[PDB]
């Protein structure tokens, strides 16, 4: 987060640091379905925003339908609509790689749908994603709004930290682990190898 500058915007990057805060997982409305009792018909609509497509589009600000093309009143069908989850997290440079006595640097990561609940505050993490500039930096009237749209989130383990360490076991590894057992001095061999 300290060596990430304005010359790396619009490129895929890997960032190291510590997770300092996570927000509440909220639903996001995509498609909404309705019912008209005067015609027995169901209607739908779609919604989109700027944080779902990597390229810039022309905005379409559609509205929430309460009324039919003739004027019939519509009932909202909450069970038939589609919702997708959302979360935001903040990353900061790890305390044992940061310069002593100096204030730290941080970066915002946006996660959606399946990557929404993978970490907790106070974790070592590695994130990969696109470093995006958003909106207009006051030219319609500080600078531009910058954030990472996450695609990969890796938990990492370090000494004196709440993330556990696990390894993938190969069948070859299993064979040695199981072979060692039969010999009746397992305790001594494992004990003498402890520091």
């Amino acid at each position: 987060p300290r060596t990430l500058t304005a010359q790396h915007l619009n490129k895929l990057v890997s960032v190291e640091g510590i997770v300092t805060k996570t927000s509440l997982v909220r639903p996001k409305l995509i498609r909404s379905v309705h019912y008209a009792a005067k015609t027995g018909r169901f209607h739908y609509r779609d919604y989109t925003d700027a944080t779902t497509t990597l390229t810039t589009r022309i905005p379409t600000p559609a509205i929430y339908p309460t009324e039919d093309t003739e004027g019939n009143k519509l009932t909202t069908e909450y069970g038939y609509s589609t919702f997708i989850d959302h979360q935001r997290i903040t990353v900061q440079e790890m305390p044992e790689m940061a310069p002593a006595g100096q204030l730290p640097r941080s970066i915002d990561v946006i996660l959606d749908d399946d990557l929404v609940d993978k970490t907790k505050p106070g974790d070592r993490v590695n994130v990969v994603g696109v470093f995006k500039s958003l909106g207009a930096g006051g030219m319609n009237q500080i600078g531009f709004k910058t954030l990472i749209l996450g695609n990969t989130v890796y938990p990492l383990h370090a000494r004196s930290t709440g993330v556990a360490a696990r390894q993938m076991l190969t069948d070859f590894d299993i064979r040695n682990i199981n072979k060692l057992s039969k010999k009746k001095d397992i305790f001594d061999i494992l004990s003498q190898s402890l520091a």
Partner: protein, 47 residues
């Protein structure tokens, strides 16, 4: 149009008759719910 329509595997007029039949038929193993309703009439039940 600007409001498109979709087709779903449901029908409300069909299930309303089923609601009515249940409320004017159910005798648990006079009719149960229609006795609840007769107590409702005389101001002796609130839910």
């Amino acid at each position: 149009a600007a409001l498109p329509s979709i087709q779903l595997p449901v029908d409300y007029n069909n299930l309303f008759n089923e609601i009515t039949d249940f409320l004017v038929t159910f005798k648990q193993d006079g009719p149960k719910y229609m006795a609840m309703l007769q107590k409702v009439a005389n101001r002796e039940l609130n839910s």
